[PDB]
Amino acid sequence: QASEETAFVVDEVSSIVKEAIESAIGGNAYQHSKVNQWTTNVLEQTLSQLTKLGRPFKYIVTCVIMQKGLHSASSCFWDSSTDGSCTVRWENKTMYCIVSTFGLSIGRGLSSLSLAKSVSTTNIA
Amino acid sequence: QASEETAFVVDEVSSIVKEAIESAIGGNAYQHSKVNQWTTNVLEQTLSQLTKLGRPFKYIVTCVIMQKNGLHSASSCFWDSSTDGSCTVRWENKTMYCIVSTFGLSIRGLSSLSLAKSVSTTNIA
Amino acid sequence: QASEETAFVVDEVSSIVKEAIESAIGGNAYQHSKVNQWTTNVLEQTLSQLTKLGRPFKYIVTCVIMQKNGLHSASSCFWDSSTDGSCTVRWENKTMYCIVSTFGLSIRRGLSSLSLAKSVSTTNI
């Protein structure tokens, strides 16, 4: 007896994202010539695995890679009852990888939406 | 003779973002102590002005500020290609960069959704 | 004294296409960050104008933008050769190419009335 999952399950998303970063860049030393290939690789596995969850969400996924200052923050106008985000901050000796995931339920109008400030923030000195 | 705008219109979004960036950090020299309030200010005005447009959209808005003292970012989306969209503005002065990404997702299920790859790419050497 | 235009009129489609490309990207130097919005813009105006003709046709429209500093493409169709058609416009400036392929498919005996047309939109740079 099962049902379609309508919630944004953060730990599930996180697991998928961490696994996509390891697969892509884990064990690599930072290489400038590779970075674009790498970000593409993190994004494609992540979205592939996310979509396979078969959950009623649109997704925005952002991947940042930086060699070893960065200040980022994200805010939303969304449904706080249905929508969610997950942020993964990964590093090794030579680089940082930050992947931000935003899920917006495909399940009135503007008055049902609210501002959420700094849902994803990243400060690297 | 007028109707609610059902489409993400990039130039309009771009103008608002540029205005928010100028207002928040324009004419300033990079200062570490200020970046957090700067970033908060860019996001607040952008989302305030976006909501005032009265369009049937949820918004995700990301702001990155970096001292000119390497950044590589890319975004990918699972969304409705006939109604959803994104806008990226890359702003600079003598001492810092400000990159603001905006994603607008309109309020058959998954079948209607489509994968958009590398929609908000920024590479700064 | 008039009647609905049931034919695919190449010169009329071509005029529309050239005007959409100019409006979208004419007078610009190639810019990497701009191509996506450019592409989207060529297609919108093209389809907006096409549909305004009020002709009984489905349209497929494809836009290619490539920087001038090799491309080979060709298209083939299984369609009604009595009623269907295509138009290709190859535009250039000092720094880029913009190729736009348009296919109009008239909205019988089923498949037995359809025909195989080869190399209808070949492009070789």
CATH superfamily of chain A: Tctex-1
Q: Using the CA coordinates, give the radius of gyration of chain A.
A: 16 Å
Class by helix and strand content of chain A? alpha+beta
Largest contact between chains: A-B, 48 and 48 residues
So, CATH architecture of chain A? 2-Layer Sandwich
CATH topology of chain A: Ribosomal protein S3 C-terminal domain
What overall form of chain A do the CA principal axes indicate? globular
- The quaternary structure here is homotrimer
Overall tally of domains of chain A: 1
For the secondary structure, the number of strands of chain A is 5
**What's the CATH first level of chain A?**
Alpha Beta
Sheet with most strands: strand arrangement of chain A? 1-4-3
Structure overview:
Chain A: GO terms for molecular function: G-protein beta-subunit binding; GTP-dependent protein binding. Chain A: Its main location: Golgi. Three copies of one chain form a homotrimer. Chain A has 125 residues and is an alpha+beta fold. The first copy, chain A, has a single domain (10-124), classed as Ribosomal protein S3 C-terminal domain (2-Layer Sandwich), CATH 3.30.1140.40. Chain A contains two helices and five strands, in the order H-H-E-E-E-E-E. The first copy, chain A, has helices at residues 10-25, 35-52, and strands at residues 57-67, 70-78, 84-91, 95-105, 114-124. In chain A, a hairpin with a 3-residue loop joins strand 3 (84-91) and strand 4 (95-105). In chain A, helix 1 (10-25) packs antiparallel against helix 2. Chain A is globular. Chains in contact: A-B, B-C. At the A-B interface, helix 2, strand 1, strand 2, strand 4 and strand 5 of A face helix 2, strand 1, strand 2 and strand 4 of B. Strand 2 of chain A pairs antiparallel with strand 1 of chain B, so a sheet runs across the interface.
